[PDB]
Amino acid sequence: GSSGSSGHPEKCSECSYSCSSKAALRIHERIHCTDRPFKCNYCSFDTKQPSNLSKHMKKFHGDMSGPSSG
């Protein structure tokens, strides 16, 4: 932890987000919400379509050294 910290009674495990009122924190957690089921493994790319992700895999992560064949 580079940046100092006051010492809030509650904090977020996902990010360095902390609040005074517990209930408040929970509300913040919402920030880590997602509507698109299909998510990428390489990057944080999420699409509400099965094809959008497929083509995206190669679109960006296509000319990469993944499989040990070729």
**Chain residues that interact with Zn ion, rule: CB under 5 A:** 12, 14-15, 17, 40, 42-43, 45
Q: How far apart are CA 12 and CA 3, in angstroms?
A: 15
* H/E stretch holding 55: helix 50-61
Radius of gyration over alpha carbons of the chain, in Å? 18
Q: Between 15 and 27, name the residue whose CB sits nearer to Zn ion.
A: 15
User: What's the min distance (Å) between Cβ of 51 and Zn ion?
Assistant: 14
C-beta of 40 vs 52, nearer to Zn ion: 40
Nearer to Zn ion, 42 or 49 (CB): 42
**Residue 45 Cβ vs Zn ion, minimum distance, rounded to whole Å:** 4
Alpha-carbon distance of 38 to 44, in angstroms, equals 11
